[PDB]
């Protein structure tokens, strides 16, 4: 360690060895978590009140979606000390299969990424969480395909 | 014309009450869909004045006039207040505005 | 209790805005302070410096027609130096590959677009986030469509 | 005219429109920046000083018809550091633009796919960042700010 | 304290330029003596035809400048159509005008030039066609008074 | 439209002088560092035209316009000509371009 | 007026050189025992300027005027500079003062 | 005539802001040494306007013209305002002047 550098910061990436779950990690190469940011239950805990930049990306992969009725979601939520209800700050939905379902052929690997980012005023003790409804379609194979992070502006 | 603000320039002191009158000249605009907007002196953030509390709105359908009483004037209640109305005849529907400046001096 | 900061803005789509994109600031988890004004659906930069501009839109439709809709989303800039609308960020997305479902109707599709970048803005510059088809907006749930700038 | 000085390492490079089958990054164009020490060498950004940076890039893919079998669109921002001289992926995304529908006696139709990547990272002096795609033949830089790549020192 | 019992018609639109739109051409419909009714919708500064049929398209713009410091300035005004059958911008009506033919106000100034441009024609439009009236130099617009810049269609 | 090259398509005969004018619309670009590029018909080279002799360059800062007069025109001077200017405000430095093509026919050379 | 500083308000750039002149009006004060004192902007303690290096002094006893040329100017050397002289005639010994402020602006650093 | 003031006679009301513009005609005069003078109605001494606060000065170097916007207008700011500039070529140093008069009217007159 040479130069100090500061601000609450976090850039966590999904655990590749979790398969059917999205577990956030910080001890893996180009990942960061320092200066007060806590990771409790896959939740980032704000250490100080101020303006933050919140972002997250998720990559979905399925092997030839046979079901027209497929819905993929990705949302970053906030539970604050002032108002103790989970509300979505950033949200996105994506329909991966436009009915087109493989009939007389073989599998069709589809990939769908979703990216979210925004600036918010957060308070001390706020709990941020990035979650998806289909954690069985997670593709954490490669490296920077799924992540979640904040930086104090 | 197209709505006529009567008190054009008023100068009152902190702690008083000014009334602004607007009169409809278009027989298609209604005294029912009236709106108010304020612009604080030296700033172009024209906001919508809310109808309640210090801001009381009186409507008289007979004379086609609506007014806006502002109570407890402060030194920050100095700006330019405009009135608005929604007009509708046949296939056309539009709105109309006015203009008139307020300056409040503090004691 | 905690002191303010720097020019910031995070505006959200109006949920009760019938088929149109009106940006709002006086709603939970939204900001517009430290000089940034929202004029006629436009953000006005109050001071010279480097800003980060971003916006997301969610498009939803209840079926794939034959028209072949093209979804666009761009953040453009009008500067005092060059009085022409120029695009800073843009993206295009085609939602329908389907050969118009003739028996399996409805089937709601969702398509998002996200834009973000760093730019140098001048005093009085007007940024505008716009889309070509404001009739496919999904402003139903909170924070699905938004637009913001922050002075870095 | 002149108002405020401004500072910190920043870069926002945009693809060259007069390039064919290539993603060539340019800095000397209208709303593009490259100042405060950031160097653009071999289609690569060279970090001039250690700190926390914000990295982002967008790519727009377009084709006028659906091709055969499955084509995969890739977009990754990589980093080769002085500390570890091997290129590792910081951000990645994959996207399938053509879902079956291999045109066999049917009309072609232009598809568009954007891909965006962004995150905060700690970079050192002399690190070489590069944003690249696997199929530079589907690039749609026919309009402005549709493909770009940038960093800013926070 | 009056009464009204007026009927309606067929797709029509007559929109007027925004006066408080700094150096830009924003089309408005909620202003006196302006129309946008019977299905014609205004999206992204574009009119969307609500039904297939025979239409009359017209538009005028007024250009004003406060001096001629360039014998090489071009003012153009075009109504273009991007159609559902052919998703490409094609010109329906176009006109070009050179506002400054002289050798620039080299001495005294205050010579405001005014040059108007008018377009009109009848066309067959389909449902969902998007019409757009545009100019090349939106910095010379004279929207100071009323009915100086406008754009409209009417279903014949 | 960030500098506007005015004579888009011009057609002159061997033995002439064509003037190409460009006017700046970006208030950050300066008339001091101007460059011209010509691309000879059929090749993609865009070599840089030099300021001197057959290529005379006239600059006027008042109207923010520059021109490039080409005299004694031959048939080897037919190509697409671009004008350029160097812009700089805060931390940003860029340049701007235009466009305009020339076609030159000969004189038939009447043989006695 | 018993010592007169000529440059009251000065504005020089980092890397320049300002000359402050003081002229004696009391024929009892001598141009030999002159002193200079500066007060750094924002601080109250008045420090005494030393004779050497950046501070070169020109004295002319004929006109009873002394000056202080300041070279290699930075932006942290902006403050109120006063001149002084020691007077002595009979049983009296006193000193005299002046006044004059300098403001230095910086030149940034062109970041490509 | 060297230097042409554009606003000859103005009649603004108390609480407003007037800008007076001057254009240089001699290519020996510089927009760098520009000065403004006011002469209060009822007195003869021409005072030198100080640029700061209510008196802001703008410059445009391309056409060699400068202006002077005065904000927060009172009723005591009625007078004859002139602009000035310093010209210098070879063995010559001179200055040039213009002219433009201001009348500012006040309020009240609440007709009852």
XYZ file of N, CA, C and O in Angstrom, chain F residues 61, chain H residues 31 59-65:
36
model
N -11.427 37.272 -40.346
C -11.903 36.978 -38.999
C -13.219 37.670 -38.664
O -13.935 37.199 -37.774
N -8.767 47.279 -28.505
C -9.835 47.032 -27.542
C -9.311 46.688 -26.153
O -10.114 46.377 -25.267
N -16.442 42.799 -24.203
C -15.579 43.042 -25.355
C -15.791 41.963 -26.412
O -16.003 40.791 -26.086
N -15.741 42.365 -27.683
C -15.730 41.439 -28.815
C -14.562 41.836 -29.712
O -14.618 42.866 -30.390
N -13.513 41.005 -29.719
C -12.276 41.290 -30.438
C -12.378 41.137 -31.952
O -11.606 41.784 -32.667
N -13.307 40.324 -32.458
C -13.380 40.124 -33.895
C -13.731 41.396 -34.644
O -13.079 41.754 -35.627
N -14.780 42.086 -34.201
C -15.198 43.345 -34.797
C -14.609 44.564 -34.100
O -14.918 45.694 -34.499
N -13.759 44.367 -33.090
C -13.149 45.463 -32.324
C -14.188 46.407 -31.717
O -14.142 47.624 -31.898
N -15.155 45.824 -31.011
C -16.222 46.567 -30.353
C -16.289 46.160 -28.887
O -16.055 44.999 -28.549
